[PDB]
Amino acid sequence: GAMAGMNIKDRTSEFQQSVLSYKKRN
Amino acid sequence: KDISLRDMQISAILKMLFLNKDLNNNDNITTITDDIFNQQEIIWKVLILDIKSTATISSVLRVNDLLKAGITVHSLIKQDRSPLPDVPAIYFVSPTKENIDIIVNDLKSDKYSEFYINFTSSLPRNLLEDLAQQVSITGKSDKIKQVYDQYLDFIVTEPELFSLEISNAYLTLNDPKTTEEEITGLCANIADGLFNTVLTINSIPIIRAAKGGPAEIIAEKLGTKLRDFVINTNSERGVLIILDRNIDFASMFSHSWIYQCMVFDIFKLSRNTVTIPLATKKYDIEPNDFFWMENSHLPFPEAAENVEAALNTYKEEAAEITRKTEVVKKLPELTAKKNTIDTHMNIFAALLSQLESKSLDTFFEVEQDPGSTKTRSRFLDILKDGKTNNLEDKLRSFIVLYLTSTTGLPKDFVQNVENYFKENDYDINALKYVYKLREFMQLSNMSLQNKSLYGLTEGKLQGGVGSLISGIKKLLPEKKTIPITNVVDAIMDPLNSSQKNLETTDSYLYIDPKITRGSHTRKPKRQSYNKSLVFVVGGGNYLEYQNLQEWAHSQLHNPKKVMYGSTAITTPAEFLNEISRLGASNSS
């Protein structure tokens, strides 16, 4: 896109923040 | 110093092998110097690929490149892989339930000290949550250092040739059987492939596509994808031309004299791996093949010549070094250089063998005239000197003629020639469907305006011939533009284009992802463009690729970069099947 791709490519935080919600529930 | 599409993918791939390093910071180099590699001091890592992703890497990188990047070992996700608890791991795998599960299993198993999950295309929330939930109940979520959607879902064959590896698309898309759902799904994937390419380019192009068929659907699909991408960011330029393979079938069968095409044609050349004839020797045209990147776009003769000029300057180069002076050899540079030469050296040789053993220079002429009996005769004339290693080419040169004809083509040929096959018994299930495609080849050829402009081998070192290079060198016709080159030309360089080509492409769906709805329309506007991405939905060829590059590499006064690609780079032979399958199916 315009060096904004680096943004769309990294999903680590999104991931971790999910791992987290799944921990709080289970 | 201009970067090719392949260089861009190799760079993205390399950046990933460095734990997506340099990301979130500064640096504009392209292929890391060693003194800098020593600046961060890198450590060995395991690299896990999967069937599809290995096909993507092995196309642009050699094993030596991997080590040089810090990759010790590489293995498929599905193999039984022996543990390396203290070594890092970079997974570059497809976004699949199957793979994710295995990452979770390896994560638990403690197969590696860390995990760098990198997805080939893009992981869906659907599966992100999945992988997350599983990992959550592990006391090891901490070991997954990063998960990235890499958007590298395509193969880059030559410097500017790419494929979505979606075989048999023309069939799937035109088979009456095919669901109205299968089609939408297919288009959706192609739309993604493109998107994957576009993001690699790091340029949001203007989409231009022929209306009416698949190309449009895909265009509007990709339009919407790119539109959201621009939005979910904040709240010259490039062009992407999406065409339907219907624009020019003649080229899917044609014969050519340029080195690549022949190799691609006569020696099923796939994944930088020529296959010369059950007998089968295999030569690898490794990217950056000193000779190849110099004589690919060249006609057989020059190429054959340039080879013997190199084997000649090699014998010299090596003589000056002969004064001073997987196996560590005395002089790698020299051995490696001679060996690339040894490759082409007999590709040309084995090529001639193939040329003569089936008199190929004939079909090439039968197709350079499409007109009066002058050519009409030369054809039956050629199928009169019967053989067998012609059978396929026969049908092809015929189809070319039947399609480019520019005038009926006597009910005679269709009968007489049709006979020559049904009697020699070589299923002509194809010539059923082919005859329909004629009305298309005729409409766009009328709608456009073509502009123009072994020891025996070590033998031909004269700068002339061997009694066979003479005929081919004289038979060098008008490398006139092809239908695709015209459409690209008019779009990339409006001001210097024929009125016909401008008017024809003028009817092409125009869409800009940076704007919202457009206006009442997306009223097509002409602009010049430096770079363009050209995608044919339903089939790609070296013939069209070759054309497009020669056209681009001859543009003085505003040079152009043209990246070509299709759902799959089909072979005259393979495409010849797809067609006949439709003639078979389009009756029962």
Curated annotation (Swiss-Prot), chain A:
Compartments, record wording: Membrane; Golgi apparatus membrane
Misc remark: Present with 300 molecules/cell in log phase SD medium.
Protein family per UniProt: Belongs to the syntaxin family.
Self-association state and partner proteins as the record states: Interacts with SLY1, STF1, SFB3 and GOS1.
Name of the protein: Integral membrane protein SED5
Function: Required for vesicular transport between the endoplasmic reticulum and the Golgi complex. Acts as a target organelle soluble NSF attachment protein receptor (t-SNARE).
Signal peptide: none
Parent sequence residues shown: 1 to 21 of 340
Organism: Saccharomyces cerevisiae (strain ATCC 204508 / S288c)
UniProtKB/Swiss-Prot annotation, chain B:
Keyword tRNA processing: no
InterPro entries (UniProt xref): Sec-1-like_dom1, Sec-1-like_dom3a, Sec1-like, Sec1-like_dom2, Sec1-like_sf
GO biological process terms, semicolon-separated: endoplasmic reticulum to Golgi vesicle-mediated transport; intracellular protein transport; positive regulation of SNARE complex assembly; regulation of Ras protein signal transduction; retrograde vesicle-mediated transport, Golgi to endoplasmic reticulum; vesicle fusion with Golgi apparatus
Record membrane topology: Peripheral membrane protein
GO function term, MF aspect, one: SNARE binding
Subcellular location(s) per record: Cytoplasm; Membrane
GO CC entries: COPII-coated ER to Golgi transport vesicle; cytoplasm; cytosol; endoplasmic reticulum; Golgi membrane; membrane
Repeat (Sequence) residue spans along the chain: 97-133, 211-236, 380-418, 422-453
Pfam families for this protein: Sec1
Region 4 X approximate repeats: start-end pairs: 97-453
Entries under Gene3D superfamilies matching the protein: 1.25.40.60, 3.40.50.1910, 3.40.50.2060, Syntaxin Binding Protein 1, Chain A, domain 2
Keywords per UniProt: Cytoplasm, Membrane, Protein transport, Repeat, Transport
Family, per entry: Belongs to the STXBP/unc-18/SEC1 family.
Description of how the protein assembles with itself and partners: Interacts with SED5.
Further comment: Present with 5780 molecules/cell in log phase SD medium.
Function: Able to suppress the functional loss of YPT1. SLY1 is essential for cell viability. May interact indirectly, or directly with YPT1.
Protein name: Protein SLY1
Annotated organism of origin: Saccharomyces cerevisiae (strain ATCC 204508 / S288c) (Baker's yeast)
Taxonomic lineage of the native organism: Eukaryota, Fungi, Dikarya, Ascomycota, Saccharomycotina
